[PDB]
């Protein structure tokens, strides 16, 4: 809430500020969704890396369920 000292960004016309605010709201939502998705992808990648380290391919279980 404290005033910025830069004051150069204030030269933009207020309609561009409104457009930036709308884009920022949409980008905040999309960035949170992307953070969730990339965290899930990193969890999957961590488990895949651990599985690669472990000797799964040397002795892996048969199919627990009939293929379908």
């Amino acid at each position: 809430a404290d005033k910025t000292i830069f004051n150069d960004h204030l030269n933009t016309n207020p309609k561009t500020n409104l457009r930036l605010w709308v884009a920022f709201q949409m980008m905040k939502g999309a960035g949170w969704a992307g953070g969730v998705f990339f965290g899930t992808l990193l969890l999957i990648g961590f488990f895949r890396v651990v599985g690669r380290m472990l000797p799964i391919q040397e002795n892996q279980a048969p199919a627990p369920n009939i293929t379908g």
């Binding site: 709201q25 949409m26 980008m27 905040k28 939502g29 999309a30 969704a33 998705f37």
Partner: protein, 48 residues
């Protein structure tokens, strides 16, 4: 489409924008994953 603007007098703008950003990203991810599902368009299947 002249009076569609009145939808912003029903739903709060910033909340709708945040939710719509989430929806757009999730839809994009869903379509990318469906494309990765098919053998064609599976661009991450670089093979020898």
């Amino acid at each position: 489409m002249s009076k569609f603007y009145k939808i912003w007098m029903i739903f709060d703008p910033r909340r709708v924008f945040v939710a719509q950003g989430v929806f757009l990203f999730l839809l994009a991810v869903m379509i990318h994953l469906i494309l990765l599902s098919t053998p064609s368009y599976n661009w991450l299947e670089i093979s020898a």
